[PDB]
């Protein structure tokens, strides 16, 4: 089998157990759903999900081996309610009967898997992500949690890699067949919430191979993703992020048609607990179609216009049609049907691994075969001979074209972009 005993998934504006065992799922009015299989646990009282497992079929009494897998997205701390953020722990999923079973909790930047046997004995294992990174790859972004249990070790894997281990030999009989309650439960703030996707309970200790494969499979999509992990949308407003220059951002140079590269403003307050680089900075960009359009979701290989808002107007990102050197500065300008420029971009995901990055390829014709260059950041000449001075600019380069063909794909490339929309899970 798939060794699966619970499989919540989405159907007809509801959640449902598709494991094949027909558990009874009850979703109250406080839980928000979407067709992309996500659901949101809020602070309000009626924001819970009760699952009544099937007591009438299999051996619903205890498990020596079992795993729990799901995707999650956890909002960033409030810049003032930091003390509350660190101090208060709260339960999100609870499965107890007769004061025994498992529960999953969150204390600030730490996520916790706790076991309790019938004797009252308790044991925990957790995962903590740094809250001082200039760019955090876990905060407010979707990642993949898997928790494997036998009778020796409780393990926590994040995105396919083992991240934590705990000895549970002292741990004895655990009661599994209790009601499963998805609810924010603790000393939380009014503005507290959690996003979850693809919840599944297995009756086996999944191997690292099985877990990594499950991660790759559930991570796959025909469409592209933004900075947080959600689908990448046409006609939506975005900031831009360079995977190779984490601390940099684009700004239209004063009295100029080119793109300057400046440094991200950081957390400038006097907490000695946290640190981040501002994300809602730089020119506000926006993706447009180029014409079977359907939904406003940006898919791979689609042809697009990269526009952005300057003052009170939508401008476009062009390139000069024939430039001599390896690379050339990009030409930002009002929207025109011009002769000297290409305006059409083909959006690619050259990476074979689960990533949130995409790349921008300039082509001659959408029917053609010749490739101009990729979009990135380059260091151009600027000043005098006495003292060499160079400057980072919003560029198009032919150099990336051969680099993308290198395997395994280099994540730190400058042709790798990620789009950052305003999200209620990120304040600054």
């Amino acid at each position, epitope marked *: 089998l798939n060794n699966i005993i619970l499989n919540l998934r989405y159907k007809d504006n509801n959640l449902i157990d598709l494991s094949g065992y027909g558990a009874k799922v009850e979703v109250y009015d406080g839980v928000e759903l979407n067709d992309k299989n996500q659901f949101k646990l809020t602070s309000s009282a009626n924001s819970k999900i009760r699952v009544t497992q099937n007591q009438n079929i299999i051996f619903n009494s205890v498990f020596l081996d079992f795993s729990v897998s799901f995707w999650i997205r956890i909002p960033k701390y409030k810049n003032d309610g930091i003390q509350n953020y660190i101090h208060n722990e709260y339960t999100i999923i609870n499965c107890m009967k007769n004061n025994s079973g498992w529960k999953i909790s969150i204390r600030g930047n730490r996520i916790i898997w706790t076991l309790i046997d019938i004797n009252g004995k308790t044991k925990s294992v957790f995962f903590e992500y740094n809250i001082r990174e200039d760019i955090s790859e876990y905060i407010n972004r979707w990642f993949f949690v898997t928790i494997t249990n036998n009778l020796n070790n409780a393990k926590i894997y994040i995105n396919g890699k083992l991240e934590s281990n705990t000895d549970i030999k002292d741990i004895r009989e655990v009661i599994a067949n209790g009601e499963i309650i998805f609810k924010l439960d603790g000393d939380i703030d009014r503005t507290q919430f959690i996003w979850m996707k693809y919840f599944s309970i297995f009756n086996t200790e999944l191997s690292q191979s099985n877990i990594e494969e499950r991660y790759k499979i559930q991570s796959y999509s025909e469409y592209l993703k933004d900075f947080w992990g959600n689908p990448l949308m046409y006609n939506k407003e975005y900031y831009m992020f360079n995977a190779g220059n984490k601390n940099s951002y684009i700004k239209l140079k004063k*009295d*100029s*048609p080119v793109g300057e590269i400046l440094t991200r403003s950081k957390y400038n307050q006097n907490s000695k607990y946290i640190n981040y680089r501002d994300l809602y900075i730089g020119e506000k960009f926006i993706i447009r179609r180029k014409s079977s359009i359907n939904d406003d979701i940006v898919r791979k290989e689609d042809y697009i216009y990269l526009d952005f808002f300057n003052l009170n107007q939508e401008w476009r990102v062009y390139t000069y049609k*024939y430039f001599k050197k390896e690379e*050339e500065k990009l030409f930002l300008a009002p929207i025109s049907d011009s002769d*000297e420029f290409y305006n059409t971009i083909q959006i690619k995901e050259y990476d074979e691994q689960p990533t949130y990055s995409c790349q921008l390829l300039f082509k001659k014709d959408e029917e053609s075969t010749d490739e101009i260059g990729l979009i990135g950041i380059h260091r151009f*000449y600027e000043s005098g*001979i006495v003292f060499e001075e160079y400057k980072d600019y919003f560029c198009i380069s032919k150099w990336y074209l051969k680099e993308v063909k290198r395997k395994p794909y280099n994540l730190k490339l400058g042709c790798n972009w990620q789009f950052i929309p305003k999200d209620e899970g990120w304040t600054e």
Partner: nanobody
Amino acid sequence: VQLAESGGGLVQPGGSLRLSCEASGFHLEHFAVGWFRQAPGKEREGVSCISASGDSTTYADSVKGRSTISKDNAKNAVYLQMDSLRPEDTGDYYCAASHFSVCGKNIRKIEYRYWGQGTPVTVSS
């Protein structure tokens, strides 16, 4: 980082004149370069421009046949030869450097970053 500007002033309708500029400040190899004329009662207009190398230069239609333009990477300088002058080509003349190497078909003041300070030419009776 400024641009020196040379070339004479007063000439008679039909003559010729050479205007030059020295790159005292930055190196000049990798930047396209342009010339702009501004007559009294008008806004600055492009006359001619050259690629960062020598791939090809573009001219305004009126002087199209008349003027020719050159660039020296050794002397770090750029020159504009204007022949058979008209009594209309009179005004202040300026030079500038582009952000890009390519010299586009049409000439936009937006692309050019340095300027200063201006050498005047006059064509009249």
